């Protein structure tokens, strides 16, 4: 079985102010276990955008149902886009660890810009 990859097929997404951005991501394996999260930015100062495991993210909807057993689609839609949303978004796989979940693989990132 090949190692899990996180595929972000789009380098750049361009969205009219007020519309919805769709940010695509696929994970190629269900192993190792752990949630997918999305961030804007890649620093230690990156901003959390979506966490599969928990949290309230009112403007984010997931394209697929992440509770389905075979799900590999981690694409999200972010609603009511404004210029403050512009930046680079990364879809990131975590594995389980102690004391907590650890980052396992990041996607290559998708630029969101606003027209």
């Amino acid at each position: 079985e090949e190692e899990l990859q996180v595929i972000q097929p789009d380098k750049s997404v361009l969205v009219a102010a007020g519309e919805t951005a769709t940010l695509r991501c696929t994970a190629t394996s269900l192993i190792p276990v752990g949630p997918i999260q999305w961030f804007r930015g890649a620093g230690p100062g990156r901003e959390l955008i979506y966490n599969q495991k928990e949290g309230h993210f009112p403007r984010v909807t997931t394209v697929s149902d992440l509770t389905k057993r075979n799900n590999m689609d981690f694409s999200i839609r972010i609603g009511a886009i404004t210029p403050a949303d512009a930046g680079t978004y990364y879809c990131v796989k975590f594995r389980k660890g102690s004391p907590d979940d650890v980052e396992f693989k990041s996607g290559a990132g998708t630029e969101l810009s606003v027209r």
């Epitope: 990859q5 097929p9 789009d10 380098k11 190629t28 630029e111 027209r115």
Partner: T-cell receptor, first 109, second 103 residues
Framework: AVTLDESGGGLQTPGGALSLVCKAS????????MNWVRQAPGKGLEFVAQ?????????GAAVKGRATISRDNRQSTVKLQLNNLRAEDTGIYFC???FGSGVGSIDAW | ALTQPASVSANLGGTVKITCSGS???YGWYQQRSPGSAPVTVI????QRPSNIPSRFSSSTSGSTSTLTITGVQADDESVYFC?????????FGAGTTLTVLR
Amino acid sequence: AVTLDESGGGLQTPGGALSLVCKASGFIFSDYGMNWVRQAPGKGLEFVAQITSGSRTYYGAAVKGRATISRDNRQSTVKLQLNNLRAEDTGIYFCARDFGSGVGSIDAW
Amino acid sequence: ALTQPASVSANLGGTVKITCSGSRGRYGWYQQRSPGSAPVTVIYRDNQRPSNIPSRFSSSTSGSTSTLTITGVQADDESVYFCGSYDGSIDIFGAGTTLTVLR
């Protein structure tokens, strides 16, 4: 009409450097990724470099460390600098525009 | 890496398929009539046909594979067809499939 006009090619010195330039017109230049793709004699298309609308840069394995791609949105140009040229760099180089998903999203050459 | 066959053939007026696999990204299909000449995009961003391209060209993408179909092959469809895709790590072209028109 979309145009992508290339210049800076021709004969080059082994070990030397070149600057290819592509001058675009007929579209909103800053919204597209721009690519350089080449083809050596008797071979297929080979990816060289790309710069996204957000100015992230990507290089093919065969030019890594020798290539620099840049864009100038105000002039609608993209430039490819390639140094320490060798025979394996001989070929036809095409400028190409992409819709944001890299080389699977090229619509004009 | 992207894998596509070296050659395919069809009759004039027939239907032909070319499959490329290896990426879960978006696929483009680029027609080149002779080596060194500008490619012509027949499909890009998976399944989109540029407006000047005849409707006989279509494609599907699913999983890690894409298939170009030409329905009603014409003599001017003879060419090499290159698949291209950014696979979420690198931008790659396949090695090209040559379409021969049988007669």
